[PDB]
Design a protein around this ligand. Structure first.
Ligand SMILES: [Cl-]
Ligand SMILES: [Cl-]
Ligand SMILES: [Cl-]
Ligand SMILES: [Cl-]
Ligand SMILES: [Zn+2]
Ligand SMILES: [Zn+2]
Ligand SMILES: [Zn+2]
Ligand SMILES: [Zn+2]
Lengths: 125, 125, 125, 124
């Protein structure tokens, strides 16, 4: 039950967000109706030699609307660690036909945004 | 068994088809003789998030001639859910030396088509 | 265990062969003295639907001299399925410090050859 | 493990970089992050005379505050350790990057910006 795409890594202190109309990863094999979903934050911690937990940079993964760990949330749902993106013309319907990725069958698609969209401040890949 | 490539998803009512000479997926690990095969339609049925059974958008998978579920089908044979493609110069011989994909050893190759390929309405690549 | 590089796939009828001075894969993290080794043919066979054994295309993998499945062979050793390549300036000494690749620790380097060299007839990647 | 493949020392000269050079290229890191150390590792094999022989030493990069010398302050003198930092990097531990787990990630091929000076016997 993995994301179809590689993650965005949060080095800065600000949560991920995109202006309305931006942020949907490029997927040339999908329809314009499909271009809508959410990024979900995944946090990891590593115990250091002093016994204390240290936070690795949070990673944000994209899931199409109606798929993934938050498949039940409607577009725009207000929830910590969840942010929403949609391209103009996308349909607000669940993308059941896309679903999630089986890592044993498909490798992750390298997340690419359009040539005119840059990553939000503090985000790297 | 499994197609070497990801599927083309049929988003509309038009079935998959290609003008003569078009439609063979890009694969640099193949010769001009090898550029011939068929797409096979596959349809899924699932229970939606609302708890109702629905038919998903059909998916079309490419297999080289003489491989896959219709390995015994001669090139050009009429069969529902099967359409044929061949690049100019391809040979009407079975492609056993390419075969099919074992998901345990190889992930699927993202299906790419050259620019200028005519696609029916509802198909994207 | 594995080769540091991806394989060359033999679609044609001719064994792999390079003119003297060509054929060593590009690896900018190695020394000029290191640029010498062999390609080893690996063949896979599958029993077809007609009960006949089918040969998948042979794959040729590069190993530095003194490493890999034929680590004991001297340069130029005459053995079926083994062909030798060396760049001008390479030293005829075993490359123990390079060794082979652990696929769990390193991905395969995509095999690239210098611009002046083209793949022998019938070979693809 | 180090996030990157090693720099192999083919000759007698140890690894070192002029000030400002030597940090591996990593697009998943900020300008603040471009600082760390290389640590030398040497393995042995039995030579033709039966005596143990040094193979070419390998130098692995770790971000500041991570890896085997995570407790070493930047610039600390220790044999087998050399320090590198790009202009603009911050002298703070890079715990948010950490080290690589070979089960989840393969090593990144170590690349250096064009014009980087390497000692004799080093290639990248
Ligand atoms: Cl940072
Ligand atoms: Cl789709
Ligand atoms: Cl062929
Ligand atoms: Cl080397
Ligand atoms: Zn950082
Ligand atoms: Zn779709
Ligand atoms: Zn072929
Ligand atoms: Zn070397």
């Amino acid at each position: 039950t993995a994301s179809w795409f590689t993650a965005l890594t949060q080095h800065g202190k600000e949560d991920l967000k995109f202006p309305r109309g931006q942020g949907v990863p490029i997927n040339t094999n999908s329809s314009p109706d499909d271009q809508i979903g959410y990024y979900r934050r995944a946090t990891r911690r590593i115990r250091g030699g002093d016994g204390k937990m240290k936070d690795l940079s949070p990673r944000w993964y994209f899931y199409y609307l109606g798929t993934g760990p938050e498949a039940g949330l409607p577009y725009g749902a207000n929830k910590d660690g969840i942010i929403w993106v949609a391209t103009e013309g996308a349909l607000n319907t669940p993308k059941d036909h896309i679903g999630t990725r089986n890592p044993a069958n498909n490798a992750a698609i390298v997340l690419q945004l359009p040539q005119g969209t840059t990553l939000p401040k503090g985000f790297y890949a």
